[PDB]
Every structure is written in structure tokens, then in C-alpha cells.
Design a binder for this molecule. Structure first.
Ligand SMILES: O=c1[nH]c(=O)n([C@H]2C[C@H](O)[C@@H](COP(=O)(O)O)O2)cc1/C=C/Br
Ligand SMILES: O=c1[nH]c(=O)n([C@H]2C[C@H](O)[C@@H](COP(=O)(O)O)O2)cc1/C=C/Br
Ligand SMILES: O=c1[nH]c(=O)n([C@H]2C[C@H](O)[C@@H](COP(=O)(O)O)O2)cc1/C=C/Br
Ligand SMILES: [Mg+2]
Ligand SMILES: [Mg+2]
Ligand SMILES: [Mg+2]
Ligand SMILES: [Mg+2]
Lengths: 203, 203
């Protein structure tokens, strides 16, 4: 009877931050914990920040592993909370890693290997971006480019189709309040219906 | 008439740090530079430090690339010094990477690919560990386990037999002062007999 590991994925500006906000308001905080990635506060965070804000560059090789290492700092914490019965709501995760790394020409099976071992999600909510959402990308940050996002999406779809992971795909076409309600409902369900040990991702 | 790139390898507790100390004392310092790996001071260093001292874990596959990236920070520096006529004395290198990564079940040819491109050594001094040396491993750090080191050695031996690299294998059975003398002698020779461009490793 652990907490549930719930992960939000999607393109930039798909509004997964908003939806995370809903869940946090819809559920009592003594039982739930919000986790954003990347965690820009850490050592690997500040560096990631410099790269996304265009005030430093790195090897494609260096950024791929900064993001990964950025997650591993927290793999202990994640595990501990779930066991302590706290449910985790996580903005971006392993998949943000692989899809974005792979979109940049990296090997999808290799990107996966690096994540291989992390706490495995019980539910992954993917937010579709329609017209007025993809074209929300105005390059204030590094990956925020319409043509590139279309490329990430190719990699996301690929991983979904591989489903050993429980995915819930939310259409772009729902109405704000209705999307909010729908998600809120699958979330609380994920939480009452959870059992067993925390899974290990891609192992 | 560059400097020579000289690399020390061997199991843990094979005393390659001692022997590096000899070379540094036996040769004038305006001409020679000592380089330890891993370079635990850097960003990838501190992380490597956390992993070896058991205060963080990571994907096997991630640690593999922490170590690699840890070497690349310095590939520029190495190159520059050799060209500037300084000889490099390096504790652990590319091979520490491959042998340890491969011992942990990774692909030997893949581990190599990641190192592929680094400055190529003119001399690689491998220190054999006998009885009282292997059994010096008491697990104060993560790879310091007798049964695992026996596995790394298998991977070292393999790479030696591939010799496109100039290796000098120093027996365990020599006497301290005599080992010191012998190494001191091959080193200064490596240094007077060096010519041409710095090689690129495994390319
Ligand atoms: O692992 C990653 N995680 C990640 O979020 N990104 C990217 C995803 C997004 O473009 C950017 C900023 O995210 P937010 O501010 O919208 O949360 O970080 C990239 C990688 C790997 C790149 Br190689
Ligand atoms: O830190 C690095 N610096 C570097 O120049 N390189 C370089 C190493 C190699 O020459 C080059 C080839 O890149 P691709 O063929 O994948 O495009 O990557 C690699 C690393 C890897 C750290 Br892990
Ligand atoms: O690339 C590597 N380089 C390396 O030095 N090591 C290892 C070799 C040794 O077990 C450990 C402790 O460092 P020392 O202070 O004794 O030099 O670092 C491991 C890898 C890859 C492992 Br996967
Ligand atoms: Mg953004
Ligand atoms: Mg966000
Ligand atoms: Mg050691
Ligand atoms: Mg050392």
C-alpha cells in the first residue's frame, strides 16, 4: 500500500505544469508530493539552467547525462516517499530524457539504458498538444522550437507503442475544466488501486 | 619532440600511486606533469566520489559515462601539454574505464567506442598484483572487492593481447627499490625516444 508514482509527460507548453497544479489542489497535501524535472536548483540543475537559457553550451554527450544524473539525485527520495505511503506527482521524467535525447540523434536503446533502474511509474499521463499549443513554442528556451518538438513527438509515440508502461493519453481537444476533471479522476484511481513493490524502470 | 604520454594501469592496491610518486621525484618537474584519474574535484568527479564512497548509486551505464566524461574534460589539456613538450604521467586512463566497465557486464567494444578519440599513450605500464596485493582489497571503496578485481584482470589481459598499444608489464615479484629503478628506466627512455604527432586512441 505504497504511494503511486505518477508522471506527467508531453511537449513544451502542453500545460502539464497546470495539470500538476490541479492534482495538488484536488488532493490533501499530507499524502502527496510534487516533483518538477529538471530540478534546476542542484549542481546539475544550475548547469542545465545555463544550457536551456543559452548562456553556456555543452556536448550533446554532456547534456544527455546532466539530465540523467539530475534524476538520479532523487531516485533515493522517490523510493523512500512511495514506501512511506506518499504519492508522487512528477513533471517530466525518464521519458523526457529519452525522447529529447533521441530527437537530437541519440540512440533510443542507449538513452534508455542510462535511465534503466529508476523507480517505475504506475501511470504516465501524456498531454497532447494541438494547434494553439505547439505553436506556443517561441524559443525563449533552447528546445522550444516547433520543428524540433515535432521530432521529439516521434520519439514519444514510439515509446508509448512499446507499452510495458501504463500510459494515459489525454486529447488536446478537451475543455480546460473537463480535462482537469478527467485527469483528477484517473489520478485518484491510480492511487487507490496501487499494490506491491515499486517497479524498476526498463529492467 | 613532444612530451611522452605515459599511463599507469593495474588493479586497486597495485601501488601505481607509489610508482607515480617515484617518477615525479626521479625527474625534473619543469618537464613533467602528474595526472590522477578520476579527477574527483570536477563536477563529474564529485559525483564519481559519491558513488565510490557508497553515498549515492547510479545506473551502471551512467557511471560508465561519468568516468568517460571525467577524462574528456582533460583531453584538451593533455594534448596541449604534450605539444608544449611536457611529458604526462597518468594514474589510470581509458583502460581503467573499459576493464572496469566490461567487468560489470558491459560491451568491451562499446566501452572502447566512448574512449575512442582520446590522446594515445606511448607507454602503458601495467602493475601486476601478487598475493599480498590483491588481498589488500578490503572494500573501503566500491570496486575494492577481491572477487570483482579478479574479473577486471580478465578484461585487462584481453586488451594487452590486442596490443596496438605499447605495454610494459611489471611483475609483482620485484623488490620495491628494484621495481622503482626498473620503471624509472623505461620511463626516461620512453621520453627520449618519442617522435611524431600525438596518436588518437582506438581510431
Ligand atoms: O532529460 C531531459 N529532460 C528535459 O526536460 N529536457 C528538456 C525538456 C524541455 O525542452 C526543457 C525545459 O523543460 P521545462 O522547463 O518545460 O520543464 O528540458 C531535456 C532532456 C534531455 C535533453 Br538531451
Ligand atoms: O565529453 C566528451 N567530449 C568529446 O569531445 N567527445 C567526443 C569524443 C569523440 O571524438 C566524439 C564523437 O561524438 P559523436 O560521434 O557521438 O557525435 O565525441 C565525447 C565526450 C563524451 C563524454 Br561521455
Ligand atoms: O572509467 C573508470 N575509471 C576508473 O578509474 N574506475 C575505478 C578504478 C578503481 O576501482 C576506482 C577508484 O579510483 P582510484 O582512486 O583507486 O584511482 O575508480 C572505474 C571506471 C569505470 C567503471 Br564502470
Ligand atoms: Mg519550457
Ligand atoms: Mg515545468
Ligand atoms: Mg582506490
Ligand atoms: Mg590513483
Amino acid at each position: 500500500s505504497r504511494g503511486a508514482l505518477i508522471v506527467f509527460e508531453g511537449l513544451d507548453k502542453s500545460g502539464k505544469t497546470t495539470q500538476c497544479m490541479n492534482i495538488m489542489e484536488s488532493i490533501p497535501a499530507n499524502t502527496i508530493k510534487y516533483l518538477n524535472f529538471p530540478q534546476r536548483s542542484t549542481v546539475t540543475g544550475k548547469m542545465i539552467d545555463d544550457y536551456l537559457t543559452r548562456k553556456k553550451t555543452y556536448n550533446d554527450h554532456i547534456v544527455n547525462l546532466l539530465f540523467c544524473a539530475n534524476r538520479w539525485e532523487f531516485a533515493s527520495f522517490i523510493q523512500e516517499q512511495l514506501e512511506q505511503g506518499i504519492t508522487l506527482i512528477v513533471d517530466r521524467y525518464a521519458f523526457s530524457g529519452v525522447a529529447y535525447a533521441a530527437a537530437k540523434g541519440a540512440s533510443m536503446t542507449l538513452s534508455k539504458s542510462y535511465e534503466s533502474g529508476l523507480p517505475k511509474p504506475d501511470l504516465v499521463i501524456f498531454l497532447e498538444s494541438g494547434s494553439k499549443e505547439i505553436n506556443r513554442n517561441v524559443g525563449e528556451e533552447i528546445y522550444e522550437d516547433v520543428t524540433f518538438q515535432q521530432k521529439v513527438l516521434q520519439e514519444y509515440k514510439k515509446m508509448i507503442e512499446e507499452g510495458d508502461i501504463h500510459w494515459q493519453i489525454i486529447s488536446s481537444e478537451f475543455e480546460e475544466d473537463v480535462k482537469k476533471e478527467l485527469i483528477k479522476n484517473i489520478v485518484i484511481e491510480a492511487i487507490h488501486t496501487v499494490t506491491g513493490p515499486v517497479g524498476q524502470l526498463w529492467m
